[PDB]
Each structure stands twice: as C-alpha cells, then as structure tokens.
Design a binder for this molecule. Structure first.
Ligand SMILES: O=C(N[C@H]1c2cccc(O)c2C[C@H]1C(=O)O)c1ccc(NCC2CC2)nc1
Length: 167
C-alpha cells in the first residue's frame, strides 16, 4: 500500500491522474520524483522549470555543480540528484525533444531509467514542450516501465484524451 491518492490504474504497474506533479510531490514526498530534464540540466520551462521554481532554484544550483563535474547527460539518459523539498530523490530523465529534431526512438531508452526505482512519481516523458505525441509516450511508458509508476498529468484536456484513447 502507498499514499498516492485517486490514481486510475491503467495496468498492473502504471497509474495516472490529472494533477500538478509539484503538488503531488509536496503532498506525498515520494522516494523518487522524475524531472523532464534536458542534457544540460537547464530547468527553464515545463516540468523542469516548474519543479525548479518549487525548490526556490536549489535544484538548478545543484544541477549546475553536477554538470560542471560530469558534463552533459545523454538523450535517453538520467542522473539521480536530491529531491530537495519535493521528494527524497529527483531522477532527471532526458527524453528526446522533437522541437530539437531528436529521435523519438530514444523515448524507450528514456523510460528504461524508471526501472531502476521500485516506485516513482513521474510526468509523461517528451510531452508538452518536448513536442512528442503524449498518447505515444503513454504507450511507450506502459510497454517499457515494469516498476510502479504514478503519472501526474498537468493539462486536463490532455488527461481526458489519454484516458479516452488508452488501449
Ligand atoms: O509543463 C508541464 N507539463 C507538461 C510537460 C512539459 C514538459 C515535458 C513533459 O513531459 C510534460 C508533461 C506535460 C503535462 O503534464 O501536461 C507542467 C506540469 C506541472 C506544472 N506545475 C506548476 C503549475 C503552476 C501550477 N507546470 C508545468
């Protein structure tokens, strides 16, 4: 049993809700919150910009030190950093950004990072300002992630479409 409330069970291991991931994280304090990161960990907008703002920019400060030491992530890759006031840990995952021309096949590799964590609160990867089809992202999630994932979807009309079209 866990404290995630009002989630729609899609499969054995994937759950979804129309909710603000910032508020879900503040309320649940999950072991892992996933960030929709880029390779430079520059948390400018979307999920990344939103989570960073909720940490009062502490996520960005930590991220800048990470990049200065380690260099950029790979598209499809990830790193584990602090969850600050939102979670124990933040798993920064880089899905492909279609608005940068990145290959959508890398979306499966991106979701594979979730399998290293037994339970996660996460956004649908490559949705919103990353420009990929969210119905596609949800399908890849269900077909790739085997651990227990709670997807928080910000946009109500996207959530309604994701529920209505899920096979
Ligand atoms: O950009 C957000 N979401 C979309 C997005 C963007 C980039 C990559 C992604 O994979 C996704 C999933 C999309 C969605 O979930 O609709 C978002 C989410 C929460 C939030 N909270 C603070 C506001 C003040 C209440 N702000 C923004």
């Amino acid at each position: 049993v866990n404290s995630f409330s009002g989630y729609l069970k899609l499969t054995d291991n994937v759950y979804i809700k129309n909710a603000d991931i910032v508020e879900e994280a503040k309320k649940v304090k999950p072991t892992v919150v996933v960030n929709a990161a880029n390779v430079y960990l520059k948390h400018g907008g979307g999920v990344a910009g939103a989570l960073n703002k909720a940490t009062n920019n502490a996520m960005q400060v930590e991220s800048d030190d990470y990049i200065a030491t380690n260099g950029p992530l790979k598209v499809g890759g990830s790193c584990v950093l602090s969850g600050h006031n939102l979670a124990k840990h933040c798993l920064h995952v880089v899905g492909p950004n279609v608005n940068k021309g990145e290959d959508i096949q890398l979306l499966k590799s991106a979701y594979e990072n979730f399998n290293q964590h037994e339970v996660l609160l996460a956004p649908l990867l490559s949705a919103g300002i990353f420009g990929a089809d969210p119905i596609h992202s949800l399908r890849v999630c269900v077909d790739t992630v085997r651990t227990n994932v709670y997807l928080a979807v910000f946009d109500k009309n996207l959530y309604d479409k994701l529920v209505s079209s899920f096979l």
